């Protein structure tokens, strides 16, 4: 069952990003805090939509896609990925990682249903690395 | 109005990009027409130094984020 | 039986030569078109009288005579010329080629009667080569610069025109055009070509690249 | 038997390109008109030599080569090309498409002799697409 | 009038030759007197650069066409 | 000191590269840290024309020799 | 047995490179001189370390590697390379060419022991071509004009230098030099070349003619 | 003295040739050395207009009479 | 028997050439007058030596040689020249025309002995034409 | 076996030409010194490439060609040339003199193999005369 993040925590994090900036160690610590439980693509996408401005959000979408593509290359380079399965029918496509696959587009409940925990942690680590890249790039 | 937005002579590029993306996304365009419009407004607005910087891009930039990253990398520090 | 060329086609060709000039590829194509069927000396002479001015016509008469003389030298060097015959009584004199022989002076019907088809095609090829010579003669690449306000396609057109219509060998035009694109073509485009992540090894590729990445203004 | 295009039509088309430009819809309609019957490489080459200036002609040669190469890749990807045959001895090389093969260089009669109708229509479509590309590029 | 034709300071040589041959052939001279007159008008008109170019001709030019060819070959490109 | 080396406004690039490589190799750095330092000093020193020339490199340059070759090819002749 | 090159010759060559530069014909002649006997990778490597600065040495290492890789591609494309053998056990790896193979690293004696004469001459030719590339790279003909006060021999020297030290094919230099003599070389010499009763078909002949008939001033 | 004879700025060429041939033939030179001296004095004296006129002779002039004829033909009428 | 021309007439002709020039019709008439009887090469040579300056005399020697060469070409083109004979032993060489043949060099008496009247009139006409050429050339 | 000239002597001669000029008697003496042994076309060509500037080198190539052509005319005028042989198969073409013949282009060893000593001395004398002409012409 999907539970959304508190809008109070999200508002506090957005104001933190607004006053301290993207690169302050306190901001990265707060992001790591709100990045503790494995989030669904819907959660991370809406979170970055709210806390980041338009141009940093575009940059972050780009960087997140690139990092997810590196993850999928490593996944096709190793059939023992915690997102993959043993047979070929469990291979994870980027539509399933970005939340674009069938039964997931716009629906967080179905998303949480079909996604694997390894998928969730890989998406989360990818999003964190992308946030770091964009923060280092913006300023 | 998005089609009246120009990058001022003294304005930085991230401020211009913020203003333009704001005015384009908060407008009456369909959702599937915002990215091409933002790109083509980056190319024709954004005073001729950045215009030539985007024109002479050895790679093809097909996303506002990629254009912003490229311009921020190769911009004239001043 | 002799049939004259249409004065309508001749008028259109004359106006083409008047507006486009003698050396344009469209003009040479039109001349090749009106040079399709083997013409009698009368036809080619009147055609050049009408389409060419007085001084180009004098030059063309000179060049036509020289080329016909080369043809007659090759003919006396080979008794199997399509204008010649097997015996010595069919040897073709320049009076017969220029239409000056007996029974031909001023009369196109008699001309068409006595002339051979090989004679006609040789006269026609000679006249075409003479026209080419005079056109190349009647009308500098290393002095061409791209003006401050000129576009790049106009500069490329002018440069390629002046380089291909010059005295360079055919195998030296592309490298010269490239190296002139690189050193002329004012420093904005110079730096645009210099910072090319790919290696451009053809004038067409350079033109395409510059047209893609040019500063819209 | 090869029949050349009328120099009157070619002169009218050249003046159309001279006054209206390369990209006007009337110019493209006129080109489509003179591109009605399948032309031999000699015909299209001389046509573009006459109607186009030197630099657009260089660009058009480049684009025509690229499009013909795409056609030959599709041809080696499908042995049922109307230019190809069933056996391997009918495979069509770029020397045969550009008119550079043996018995064709400079001779339009021999060209018309050895070429296939599928070859002719493929060459013609390739030349039309190349003209469109160059027209979109020049202005 | 043929005897009043001069090559202008800015005029090219083929235009001057065209004008002169036109005025000489469309005049009251006998047919056997046109070529010598055209030659001697090329030599005395046709401003002193081309005058000296024709004067210092290592070969003898005995026809208007030959003079035109020689001058077109050795003319000062400008 | 290697970290104080700048390319002068009038200095050529091969002289700057010679001076920088000399000061970096004749210093207290480990041998495995000289190439990355030389590259990152080419990128941040070497006044902004060459900085932008290296930044807009369609290929990725991963060696001081490759950077030197690229810059020598595409440098602004002056 | 390995014999080192004289440090006196190496010092003289280094000072030659220091004063004349990398691209002078005297410098290339001196390098060809010291490149006469087939050198071991150790010799050429130390030679380029001594005569070249740090940045040209890096460039030269790059170019030498690329040329050796082309050589090894040609070697795997032909089993009859003078560096190769007939069986597969004599195939020459780049570690053996660059001196990195086993029993060769840092030891010139062992190097000279295991290397083939074909290997040595291939390495030497590769190093010479790499030196040529780097020299052409370390340091525009269509922009050269004869100054109002400049003499003609200086202009000809500058133009021939810039044309021969450029990217043109070898068969396109003479026509370009001639056509640049004709269109550059301010209008007095332009008219002097134009009114040439003879046809000049060589840069040397044009230079001789102009030097004969030039306006002494 | 023959070696001191120059063609004056206003003097015609036939007067200069007369004076020079007179002074050369009425001197102490051997008879077999007069023609080469007269030729080489025509070439080096005879102020630079005629000097260049003789220099650019498509034919080789090997006699004082031939040089005189050539110069009289192609001289600048003034 | 050879009789020399009067030095009084030669002095008057020289002063005429000195005052009127080479091209005046009175000068040409006077030359035609002193060119009435067929002169020997010695006579014409000395006459031109006296009346002409050094440079016109060189030009006249050249022109006289050229005209005599044309005459000798016409003579070898027709064996019925009044200077020639019927057999090949009477063919007239340029040494006999210019007075350079054997028994003639410097001796006017021997000259008058061996020369033919046709030879004399041909030499005279040649000299007159050469004088005309040089006069037209000098001014 | 071919032995190259010392680059030290060539450098000294080049500096002599640079300071004293082309026409000084000391320079001509030095050239005669380095022109002592019969040189192959490769040697003389590279020597003139190094010691002479670009424009004097062009002039020297022209003059050397002209002098070699005069030599070949004298050779076809006398079958007893030290470069020629007795039969017609040893006649020396300009491709063999300028080093352009087969087996000689760019290879000094093969050059030294096929060339005759008479060929070498004729080439050397021709090059010396050409150097004299160019030196008299340059200044």
Author numbering:
A (entry chain H), D (entry chain C), I (entry chain J), J (entry chain F): 10 to 148
B (entry chain G), E (entry chain A), F (entry chain D), H (entry chain I): 152 to 229
C (entry chain B), G (entry chain E): 10 to 148, 152 to 229
Describing publication, verbatim:
As the virus buds from the cell, the viral protease cleaves Gag into several fragments, including the capsid protein (CA) that then assembles into the mature capsid shell (core), rendering the virus particle infectious.
Most important, we determined the structure of the mature CA pentamer in these polyhedrons to define the interactions between hexameric and pentameric RSV CA assembly states. According to these criteria all hexamer and/or pentamer pairs were classified into different classes belonging to six general groups. For further analysis, we rigid-body fitted individual CA domains into the EM density maps of hexamer/pentamer unit pairs. Pentamers, on the other hand, organize rigid vertices, where the lattice is curved in different directions. The hexamers that are adjacent to pentamers are deformed to allow bridging of the tube-like areas and the pentamer vertices. Specifically, the two CA monomers facing a pentamer adopt an arrangement similar to those two CA monomers in the pentamer, causing an increased spatial separation between the CANTD’s of the hexamer. State A was found in all dimer interfaces involving pentamers (with higher curvature) and low curvature hexamer–hexamer interfaces, whereas state B was found only in hexamer–hexamer interfaces with high curvature.
